[PDB]
Amino acid sequence: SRVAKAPVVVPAGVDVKINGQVITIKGKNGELTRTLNDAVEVKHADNTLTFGPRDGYADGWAQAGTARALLNSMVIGVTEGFTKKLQLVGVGYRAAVKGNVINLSLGFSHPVDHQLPAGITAECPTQTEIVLKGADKQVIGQVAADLRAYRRPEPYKGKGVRYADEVVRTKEAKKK
Amino acid sequence: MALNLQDKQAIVAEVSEVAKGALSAVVADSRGVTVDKMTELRKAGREAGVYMRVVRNTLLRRAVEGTPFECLKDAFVGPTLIAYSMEHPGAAARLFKEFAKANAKFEVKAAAFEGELIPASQIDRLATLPTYEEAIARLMATMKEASAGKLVRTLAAVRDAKE
Amino acid sequence: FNRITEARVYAADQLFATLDPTLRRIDVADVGETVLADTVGFIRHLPHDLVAAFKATLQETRQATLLLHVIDAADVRVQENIEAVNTVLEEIDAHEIPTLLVMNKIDMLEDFEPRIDRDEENKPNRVWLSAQTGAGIPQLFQALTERLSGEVAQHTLRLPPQEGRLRSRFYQLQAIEKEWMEEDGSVSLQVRMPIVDWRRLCKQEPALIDYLI
Amino acid sequence: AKKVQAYVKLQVAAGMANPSPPVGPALGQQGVNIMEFCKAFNAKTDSIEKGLPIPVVITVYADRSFTFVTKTPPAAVLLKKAAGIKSGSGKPNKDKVGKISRAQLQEIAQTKAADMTGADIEAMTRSIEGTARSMGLVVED
Amino acid sequence: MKVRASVKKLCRNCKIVKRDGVIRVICSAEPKHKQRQG
RNA sequence: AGCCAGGAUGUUGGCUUAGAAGCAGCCAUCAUUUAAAGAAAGCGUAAUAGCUCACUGGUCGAGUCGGCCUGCGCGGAAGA
RNA sequence: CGAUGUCGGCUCAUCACAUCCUGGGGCUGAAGUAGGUCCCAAGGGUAUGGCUGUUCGCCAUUUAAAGUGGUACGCGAGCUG
């Protein structure tokens, strides 16, 4: 409700473009439409991004406010990127970049690799760290943790990829 | 805002102090360390006693409630932290230039002098009232052409204090 | 069990004065923590199938590293009861365990002042108690302190102003035996720990302080 | 207040104390020198009555300055140094041991004025009351 | 975790949640608090 | 609701003790300042010192927080 | 009751899932080793001998596992007696 009726406002560098329920969003480097809109009659004007429930839906401000939050996320996306500091730590571990494939080293016999779908790239300030950079705010962090997914860090020394900084459980029971 | 009586006694504090106001003074704040108040609580504490006093809860929908002068040189009170500070008799302008001369730390500042009760001015220098309350600019620089009555004080200090 | 534990375990003339095993930890000079669990009291010729059902409850006794054994001092029944107890001990294994007799109830007898009573250097010792007074305890614990260990090569540790961490570890785990600060922050100490400590310590800490191994 | 590292006020006793408890791992926890500081401290044991326990606020730079800053001994400490009790009650206010006259407390606000938010000396002395009662020492004028 | 037919909560950080038809609930005090299918 | 900032002086309360002090305890836990801040709600330290709310100013601009009653629904709910 | 043959074994399977392993996960008093529970799972697979009519139970040695129970206490117009 709140933000759901809060206008989005379109920044001048960014170029919003309504087309049916969806809205193409050309921008500083982004240019897409995560959004799809079942119900809310969202609409452009000066920059004015209309919302409020259209017919009857009950999903009204739910979906609508969701839509704002999306495109509003999206336009900020077509500005620039997001999720970062996808760190890994503990002895013997390391990581690397190439092309779009990402190296990782986790005590496994087979080397750890997965290749990014585009719209995002990465870097290696160290093998200890992979920094990410993606045009659209969802997929970047999702896949980022999906990059973490191969090794949810272990409680007893924190080994395992740790998504962002993220203090975790740290017990010391049944040791020596 | 708070409970009724609290706001009420607050406004009473404002007005009864308005009649008390030997010289109002205003300062926007931000970092808000406790030492702030304590510093003034020594500025208004035993270093020279009470003769200035601190208040918060300060709004455009609060501060104007407090004076017949109302928002005049007082509308400035409201936004952000406002440890609004009125000086008290025996202090015609003591602790009014002190703010900007102890100024450094984004707090304790004259804001180009913001007295209401008397100065009726803002964002214009009003060190004049501080520039009064004095003898040395009256007794030596003008060779006693100010301490010898308003009549020569009128005839001097056109270059010193708008008279 | 009461006095040693400062815990709530009721006692009265009646048989079955206790039921249910009961855990509470206690101090010891050489392992600090020390788990306790009271067993039900015995009789002559306790039922067969009882035990067979009762192996669960005594399943704690088996593993138990030491069979402390209180005995009465008022009854002429003395010998017999031991012979009574030995009986069931046989059938439930672990009568191979080292034991420690306590001729409890010294009050009535004024048998002796409570004392150490090295049966030998081995110590399956008699111990001089009257538990309701429990006056005999310190000898019980001390004798015990002799009876369970395996590394008393003590060391006199020391450091220069870098010991807050030492005092740390020592209070943290077991004990400094003695804390004596001395000149320019050089500080000497004495400590006695079981060896697993010695290596967890020698590993984790730089231990170039090297008095402990 | 707060409890993980920052600047180190240290409740140092006057006179020598080079080993651990005030300046060892205590003050060595910022890598601070023992000597010259204790010399700086011992040089300041002159004015403060000798042997008196006393908090000190260290100045440190990037290099961790040797500069010390003197503080008044605490009012409760002033009381324990007044009534002369070796040992405060285990239930202060409830348990008690002796008493102390207010004039002492007046002298106390007189020196603790350096550490009072109170807008008045009486309020200060009353913060000295907030420790006075609080030690279990009986309060009187 | 458990499937305690009664659910309630186990800290102050605990919070009831719907997921699917199922009534989940979680904390973060310790995860073990995870009641569900109540 | 989120957001801007403050979080105070007695006083690391006395006792405990290597060390306890908002957070080993113990019992006291006041007095102060202020809109504001508990000798304390959680983390932390060997301990010392960080870290967050309770407290409040500001912010922002309409509603907001609950218990009670009550229809109809979910969870509980596995068989040859 | 103008008749429905009854225990155990022996050929033979059939389902359930209230899980014996293997399969997938939650927590753990989950160092790892391992477990314990819980959830999900029915695809398949899941001890010969000693003793006794035995089912059992006990015992010796195994295997990953020696799961439960239903089915005229599945199975005598198939035998066994």
UniProtKB/Swiss-Prot annotation, chain A:
Q: Which is an annotated GO molecular function term of this record?
A: large ribosomal subunit rRNA binding
Gene3D superfamilies linked to this entry: Ribosomal protein L6, alpha-beta domain (3.90.930.12)
InterPro entries, A to Z: Ribosomal_uL6-like (IPR000702), Ribosomal_uL6-like_a/b-dom_sf (IPR036789), Ribosomal_uL6_a/b-dom (IPR020040), Ribosomal_uL6_bac-type (IPR019906), Ribosomal_uL6_CS (IPR002358)
GO CC aspect terms: cytoplasm; cytosol; cytosolic large ribosomal subunit
| Highest taxon listed in the record's lineage | Bacteria
User: Which BP terms in the Gene Ontology apply to this protein?
Assistant: cytoplasmic translation; response to antibiotic; ribosomal large subunit assembly
Which key words are in the record?
Answer: Acetylation, Antibiotic resistance, Ribonucleoprotein, Ribosomal protein, RNA-binding, rRNA-binding
N6-acetyllysine: residues carrying this PTM: 43
Oligomeric state and interaction partners are given as: Part of the 50S ribosomal subunit.
NCBIfam families linked: L6_bact
Q: Which family does it belong to?
A: Belongs to the universal ribosomal protein uL6 family.
Task: Report the protein's function.
Answer: This protein binds directly to at least 2 domains of the 23S ribosomal RNA, thus is important in its secondary structure. It is located near the subunit interface in the base of the L7/L12 stalk, and near the tRNA binding site of the peptidyltransferase center.
Question: What is this protein called in UniProt?
Answer: Large ribosomal subunit protein uL6
Species assigned in the record: Escherichia coli (strain K12)
Curated annotation (Swiss-Prot), chain C:
Q: Summarize what gene deletion causes.
A: Disruption does not affect lambda lysogeny or the transposition frequency of transposable elements.
GO function terms (MF aspect): ATP binding; ATP hydrolysis activity; GTP binding; GTPase activity; guanosine tetraphosphate binding; metal ion binding; ribosomal large subunit binding; ribosome binding
Q: Which residues form the Hflx-type G domain?
A: 1-152
- GO cellular component annotations of the record: cytoplasm; cytosol
Q: Name one GO biological process term.
A: rescue of stalled ribosome
Q: What is its main location?
A: cytoplasm
Cofactor(s) recorded for this entry are:
Mg(2+)
The compartments listed are:
Cytoplasm
What exactly does this protein do?
GTPase that associates with the 50S ribosomal subunit and may have a role during protein synthesis or ribosome biogenesis. In vitro, also exhibits ATPase activity.
Q: Which family does the record claim for this protein? A: Belongs to the TRAFAC class OBG-HflX-like GTPase superfamily. HflX GTPase family.
Cite the record's note on assembly: Monomer. Associates with the 50S ribosomal subunit. This interaction occurs in the presence of GTP, GDP, ATP or ADP, but not in their absence.
Its protein name is GTPase HflX
Q: Which organism is it from?
A: Escherichia coli (strain K12)
Chain's gene name: hflX
Q: Which residues of the full protein are shown?
A: 214 to 426 of 426
From Swiss-Prot, chain D:
Q: Which Gene3D superfamilies match?
A: Ribosomal protein L11, C-terminal domain, Ribosomal protein L11/L12, N-terminal domain
Subunit info here reads:
Part of the ribosomal stalk of the 50S ribosomal subunit. Interacts with L10 and the large rRNA to form the base of the stalk. L10 forms an elongated spine to which 2 L12 dimers bind in a sequential fashion forming a pentameric L10(L12)2(L12)2 complex.
Q: Which GO terms describe its biological process?
A: cytoplasmic translation; ribosomal large subunit assembly; stringent response; translation; translational termination
The organism's taxonomy opens as: Bacteria, Pseudomonadati, Pseudomonadota, Gammaproteobacteria, Enterobacterales
The protein, known as: Large ribosomal subunit protein uL11
Q: Which UniProt keywords apply?
A: Methylation, Ribonucleoprotein, Ribosomal protein, RNA-binding, rRNA-binding
Q: Which residues carry this modification: N6-succinyllysine?
A: 71, 80
One cellular-component annotation, GO: cytosolic large ribosomal subunit
Q: What gene makes this protein?
A: rplK
Which protein family is named in the record?
Belongs to the universal ribosomal protein uL11 family.
A single GO molecular function term of this UniProt record? large ribosomal subunit rRNA binding
Q: Which residues carry this modification: N,N,N-trimethylalanine?
A: 1
Instruction: Mark the residues carrying the PTM N6,N6,N6-trimethyllysine.
Output: 3, 39
Its annotated function is as follows: Forms part of the ribosomal stalk which helps the ribosome interact with GTP-bound translation factors.
UniProtKB/Swiss-Prot annotation, chain E:
Which residues are the signal sequence here?
none
Query: Which branch of life, at top level?
Result: Bacteria
Is the keyword Hydrolase assigned to this protein? no
Example GO molecular function: structural constituent of ribosome
What InterPro entries does the database record attribute to this sequence?
Ribosomal_bL36, Ribosomal_bL36_sp
Q: Membrane-spanning residues where?
A: none
Keyword rRNA-binding assigned to the entry: answer is yes
Q: Any one cellular component term from GO for this entry?
A: cytoplasm
Q: Which UniProt keywords apply?
A: Ribonucleoprotein, Ribosomal protein, RNA-binding, rRNA-binding
Any single GO BP term: cytoplasmic translation
UniProt xrefs under HAMAP family: Ribosomal_bL36
Which NCBIfam families would you find in this protein's record?
A: rpmJ_bact (TIGR01022)
* Assembly behavior: Part of the 50S ribosomal subunit.
Record-stated family: Belongs to the bacterial ribosomal protein bL36 family.
Q: What does this protein do?
A: One of the last ribosomal proteins to be assembled in the 50S subunit, it contacts a number of helices in the 23S rRNA, acting as molecular glue. The simultaneous presence of uL16 and bL36 probably triggers ObgE's GTPase activity and eventual dissociation from the mature 50S ribosomal subunit.
Q: What is this protein called?
A: Large ribosomal subunit protein bL36A
